[PDB]
């Protein structure tokens, strides 16, 4: 009611002439189920931090959404994944690149930022920090399904002739967190990493501001630093969150040549959801309330 | 039309009592050759991508510096070097982190940015990525020294970077680094990270940032920096002062920043002991730096 959970499954050109009702629904479902286990968790006087770990765990978990079950491939049918987690009361922040072994980057993240003194490892020593303290080591077999690899398939074909999920959550204390978690893009160099693990680029909070998780054109995120600026333009500028968010998502990011869109809450409890291309799987929902759900435009 | 380089070789705990004056000088005069070679550079008319790539490469060459030959060892004595190259009148940005095989980290960062789509590679990919390009690959013995051997040893009981405005009215910046002694193999710091460690972009201000990594990404120091500037109205000095003095402090941070505004305005804050570094204008005589004054 000030409390309040957004969600995103990734930006992109989602079109709604290929789309049935029925197949729309399971994105929608997986959607509800998700930001109400959130409210739920704001409601109940759970932390921002918790909220958007677990939140971002259960899109992980989902094979609709590419992070973790249900990551892209690689150029090589490989899987490599990377996760962010912020706690804007702490300002500490823990991310994973390059894992493949993991089967869920936003807790290696969540285990980077609680029981290390750094906030970034990366592939198989970020792998080997995480299994030592006791996370399971898995098959990256484990990630793929078949709808997947057709993209892979597809895009091959494409070049032949020719995004990210993540969570924000004011809780009922006033701590702001984010999370973003992604299993890359299809047909991806290997080793190549984009926004989602990189504190200010794909993830960002802070009590005093904002906290933010975006979904989108990696490099040009990372250039642009899209979830700090956000901060910033509020912070240094005074713009509103939606001021702030028009200025990024709308103008910014497009001019730099960058298409997908971010989540984002301020302190004060407004939610935000710009997105500049023709959809962005996405949920929002004041504790205490009934959540939205939302796909295409409006 | 002020040309200006400025360039560091790390922050910190430089202590006068552990070191010699002949220690001292060899720094002073490394310091002092790579400025001067940047300087003649922007004097002759070359980029500020040019400039501060070529500082970089030269202070990794150096084996007296924490980046590129003379890295320090992690926990498993092996090398891990990280880099990001920034060109503020694209913000193009090209970054390697977590390799082994490469001889000048600054090189990868910048093939990186000129022959892929992408900002960021990381570790045996950045390395397959640099030798498809034609770089050379290394054996990962080449960045070692019995000096940082030896502290590898004794621990068992910062980087290197380069900001320019060219005579075009262009900023750019890069970063590198070997990392930490006894470092923990795959954690990346501030080095390689846009924003944190490296930043550039024409209307505001070049940056490159050396201390403790970790606080240097939570605070995203580099474009702070720029963003306090362009948004806040802050100058140059304001900036550096609140980044330096006060917030990283404030977040357990040690360590400091070069940086170059779009007016020729140049910044060396920094919060520990010392901080290896240097700057001078085109046309004009390099200051050098170890403590403070
Ligand atoms: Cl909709
Ligand atoms: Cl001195
Ligand atoms: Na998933
Ligand atoms: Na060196």
Redesign the interface.
Same mark, same amino acid.
Request: charged content about 20%; cysteine-free.
């Given at each position: 009611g000030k409390a309040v959970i957004a969600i995103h499954g990734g930006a992109g050109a989602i079109s709604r002439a290929q789309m049935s009702l029925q197949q729309e629904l399971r994105y929608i479902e997986a959607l509800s189920a998700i930001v109400e286990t959130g409210q739920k968790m704001l409601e109940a006087g759970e932390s921002a931090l918790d909220v958007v770990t677990e939140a971002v765990r259960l899109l992980e978990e989902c094979p609709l959404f590419n992070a973790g079950i249900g990551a892209v491939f690689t150029r090589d049918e490989t899987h490599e994944l990377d996760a962010c987690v912020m706690d804007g009361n702490t300002?500490? @922040?823990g991310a994973v690149? #390059?894992v493949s072994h993991l089967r869920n980057p936003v807790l290696a993240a969540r285990l980077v930022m609680e029981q290390?003194?750094?906030?970034?490892?990366?592939?198989?020593?970020?792998?080997?920090?995480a299994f030592a303290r006791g996370m399971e080591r898995v098959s990256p077999e484990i990630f793929s399904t078949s709808l997947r690899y057709e993209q892979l398939l597809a895009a091959r074909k494409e070049g032949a002739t020719v995004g990210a999920v993540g969570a924000v959550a004011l809780d009922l204390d006033g701590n702001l967190a984010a999370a973003t978690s992604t299993g890359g893009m299809t047909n991806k160099?290997?080793?190549?990493?984009?926004d989602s693990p990189?504190?200010?680029?794909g993830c960002y909070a802070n009590n005093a501001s904002v906290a933010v998780s975006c979904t989108g054109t990696?490099?040009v995120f990372?250039?642009?630093?899209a979830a700090?600026?956000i901060a @910033?333009?509020m912070?240094? #500028?005074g713009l509103s969150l939606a001021e702030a968010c028009e200025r990024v998502v709308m103008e910014k990011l497009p001019a730099?040549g960058g298409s997908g869109g971010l989540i984002a809450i301020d302190h004060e409890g407004n939610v935000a959801l710009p997105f500049n291309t023709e959809g962005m799987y996405r949920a929002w929902g004041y504790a205490g309330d009934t959540p939205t759900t939302g796909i295409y435009r409006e």
């Open positions: 300002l500490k @922040a690149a #390059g290390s003194p750094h906030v970034m490892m990366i592939g198989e020593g970020a792998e080997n920090f160099l290997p080793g190549r990493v984009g990189l504190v200010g680029a990696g490099e990372i250039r642009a630093l700090y600026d @910033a333009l912070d240094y #500028g730099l």
